[PDB]
Symmetry: C3
Subunit: 388 residues, 3 copies
Amino acid sequence: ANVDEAILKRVKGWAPYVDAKLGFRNHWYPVMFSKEINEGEPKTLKLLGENLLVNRIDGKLYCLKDRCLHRGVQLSVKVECKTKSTITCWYHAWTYRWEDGVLCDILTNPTSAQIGRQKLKTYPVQEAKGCVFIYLGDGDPPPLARDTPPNFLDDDMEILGKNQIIKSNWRLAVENGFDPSHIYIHKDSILVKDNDLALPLGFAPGGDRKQQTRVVDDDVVGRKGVYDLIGEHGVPVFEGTIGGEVVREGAYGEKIVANDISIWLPGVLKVNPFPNPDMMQFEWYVPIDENTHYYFQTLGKPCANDEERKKYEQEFESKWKPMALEGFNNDDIWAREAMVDFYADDKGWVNEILFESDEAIVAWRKLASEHNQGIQTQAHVSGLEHHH
Amino acid sequence: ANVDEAILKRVKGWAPYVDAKLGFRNHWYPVMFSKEINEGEPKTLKLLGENLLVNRIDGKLYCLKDRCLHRGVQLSVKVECKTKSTITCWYHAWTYRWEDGVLCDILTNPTSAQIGRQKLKTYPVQEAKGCVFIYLGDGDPPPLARDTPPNFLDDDMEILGKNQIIKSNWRLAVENGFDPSHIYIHKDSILVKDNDLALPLGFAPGGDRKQQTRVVDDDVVGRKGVYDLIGEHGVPVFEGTIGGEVVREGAYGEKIVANDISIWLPGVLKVNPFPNPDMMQFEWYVPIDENTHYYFQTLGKPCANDEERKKYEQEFESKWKPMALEGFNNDDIWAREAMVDFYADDKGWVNEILFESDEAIVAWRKLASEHNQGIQTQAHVSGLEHHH
Amino acid sequence: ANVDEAILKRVKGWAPYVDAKLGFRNHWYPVMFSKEINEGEPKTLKLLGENLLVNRIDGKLYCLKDRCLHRGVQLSVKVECKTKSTITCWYHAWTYRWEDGVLCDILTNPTSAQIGRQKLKTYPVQEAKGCVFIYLGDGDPPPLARDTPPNFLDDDMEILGKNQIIKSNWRLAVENGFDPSHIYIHKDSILVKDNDLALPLGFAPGGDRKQQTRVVDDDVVGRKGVYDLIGEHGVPVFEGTIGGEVVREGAYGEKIVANDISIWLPGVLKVNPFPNPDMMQFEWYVPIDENTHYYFQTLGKPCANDEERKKYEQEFESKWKPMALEGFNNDDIWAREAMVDFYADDKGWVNEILFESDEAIVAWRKLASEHNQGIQTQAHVSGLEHHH
Ligand SMILES: Oc1cccc(-c2ccccc2)c1O
Ligand SMILES: Oc1cccc(-c2ccccc2)c1O
Ligand SMILES: Oc1cccc(-c2ccccc2)c1O
Ligand code: FES
Ligand code: FES
Ligand code: FES
Ligand SMILES: [Fe+2]
Ligand SMILES: [Fe+2]
Ligand SMILES: [Fe+2]
């Protein structure tokens, strides 16, 4: 659908994933934090190539396609919300209900036969853990838990985070995050020295192929994901040699992190514990268009009361955000960016030469291929085909 | 020719118009004002995708294709007019006559067998009402009147105006201008308050389909156009309601404007009277390339002598230009711009959902389809095919 | 391979040359000066569309493809040379030898089965006359002399020069340089007045077609090129006339230059003597990508000892560089640039109308077509096709 059939033919193992340049339809995705959207102040964003509007009305979020049915302009060019329940296109005043997208009035012609007989696409929106999720899909949504990693929605789990737009395809981001050997790029992170981390350079794998991961399709809430098990039969590498000469060493700090690493559909990584033994990291790589994603980073820590919550928050702002989310993950950003050119023409998928630790990535590509809930296409983006 | 055959098949009603992305060949178009081009000071512009040079020689305008026959460079990169009758290419000094485009000399080789045996394309140029029109077409031109709205060329009609380059396809501009319901976007114009205009929000149409317009193919000078008659059987809308609640009102001033609205091939709108009961507006949307047009705005007022002419001019500069041509029509510019994305892939033509007041636009699309004098193509732009 | 088959069919005379948009593979090309690359300080450049790294190790130059075999990132994003013999990719620490490109270690997994079993492409590099040449080709290189003009590699010949990136295809540059009538564009050069040059406006050719050039395929070092002989039977033009009227004259200085003009594969011009009777100019137009070339300019003067060498150098810096390489050849840069649009869609090759002095260019197009050592293609650039 999105990629040259000749390339798709050559990746048998994982063709749906190679075709899913625009992401997977019929999943939940986080797009902003709750606190970024106030009552009666609509926001625009692009998700899976679709321009969307989000509004908060009597405290509740609603999401409309930001494209008028009439002449295809963005309503957001000049927002006119003239009743709490509605938005009016600035051009010829077609008026839509936030609740169901129905065209309920046309100010320029209240006799129009179109009234009541057209409807703008809406998507479900839910807030959880101070995060706004959109179900970019058709029909009744699944529970959010299906599309979130374990423990993210636990009652006591306190989530704080950061979001930004990054110029790479979302798959380059997923793969970088779940890539065991990419830990090499983090060897000089301020986080490593300043938080006294143990951090190898890499891994000498052991065991068989199947032992390198746990593929999860037996989670009772219907989550689908892969655990990275390279360290169970594998040996961490702390000394990097060239021709037998040690030229680089790993980090020999005390704090043990990243015991459990798992990637989940639609594209969220959970690293536990990280960046400190008492907290976890959940990060999403949300498709905006073929070239760009939201890097939606969260750190979670179980907190028992408002006191714990407020100090977590203060540590987050003074330490974990600059030192970890920025000081550790900034290198991930430019690593993703550096793979853009090779994958741009869809040929990186066939001309890459993988090595042993990439078994984790292969397992993900296969899981995503088999268990995604739909391939987003340009027809989804450009819409229904009329023959008037 | 310009658009995917599959799309053209789906717009039966008006396929030539959908194909005419680059505009209609074999019409007159205004491109600048007379006062902008002085004796012996050639100017460059692009019209229907073609790079042109215009010069004034003994008071008269001439137009040459700005592309040397030899290696295809623009002569205008470095203009060398070394005799009044000629221009010399800066590269190998092929020299062309302004009057007929004939290659009359080559300074670098006066023995060349090419001399007298090659000719650059020329186009007819006429000045009228202080406006420079180019006939972008082949063969002997029609009278200018054929391609101008009624009354524009009347003896007493004094024309003043403004020109600029706007980033939309020319058809988006035509349609916006001739769109009865688009009056909604003008509801907050400074012109409306400050010139005490009556201006509805829209129209409740009445009568039959055919009564909504007058299609003109019986004009004796051969003009072809459409009058917008929505107000003859229709009722203006001054109260905009949502769920029966009045949320916006029109403008209840005294001055009645825009009694007669007509669109004419090749793409010129006449609104009478406007922006004041004693004057009219004529505006062209001239194709530059597929993405851009000249928005060539003129206001006309019958003046009996130099006294009337000079005060018209002073009102124009102090009032009508800032208040009307800018303060009213600026909103039209960004409205055009907002339709670009939907129409960019040629699919807006099939995926738009039209309503009743768009009958005027449909009538234009059909008139333009039937009565245009040719479809400009990329072959016109890139030129004659040689097999040397 | 690179151009629409329908266009290639129409240039029978010279189709390989029209197809060679990215240049000719299996030739030597100069890319920088020796003094620009220091011991242990690798540099990045693009040549024939390929991203390359060059390093100096124990005084000797080596060239590796700047694209990791693993995930296709540029090694140069963050260079890690951790042993003199090697470079380590910043991402997962695949480590390559400069000498043969072999993957000799992987810091992230020293047990990997890939080690010793993969190799990055290398290219031969030679320095001569203070210029760095890369053999962008496969297999054992020819002698450099094959791909350089006569006398460039003479022992006593002292070469100084300048390099920059110019935004045109390399062929537009070659043709401009070897175009006899293009001398017109140089008629106002500061060099002409300030160095008292004789410089005609052009040439009235005489003799037959074959007499206009000498095609060289009998050089014993295997050079292939064309001498421009237009002045042997032709008469220089010093008076430019339009309708018989003299409107421009040539330059009637004393110093006679450019007696011998020759173009050589892969695309180097030699003008002798120039810009002074006692020196010569050699200039390369090196393909970077389809849109851009290095304009690699050198001036050569036989020098007998260090005294002559040092004064040559001082004249070069104070006079010949600003006055000739800049003051004369700057006009060549913008002339090349002005042909870009006509040749951009590959149609200039068929829609150009050539005249008599272009016989030199035709002879080159045919020589290049017949004697080039390979057509660079996008498959060369994007690489070997794997079916893992
Ligand atoms: O995307 C990510 C975010 C945060 C931590 C890691 C990590 C993985 C392995 C070892 C150390 C850190 C990661 O991959
Ligand atoms: O393009 C245009 C230029 C000037 C005036 C109008 C107009 C049309 C209807 C009602 C009021 C003004 C317009 O369409
Ligand atoms: O590329 C070039 C570089 C330097 C000199 C010339 C030249 C050619 C003919 C006559 C005069 C100068 C040239 O073509
Ligand atoms: S484009 Fe929105 S009402 Fe017309
Ligand atoms: S390109 Fe104009 S004379 Fe050669
Ligand atoms: S991309 Fe270079 S080692 Fe992985
Ligand atoms: Fe990372
Ligand atoms: Fe308007
Ligand atoms: Fe030159």
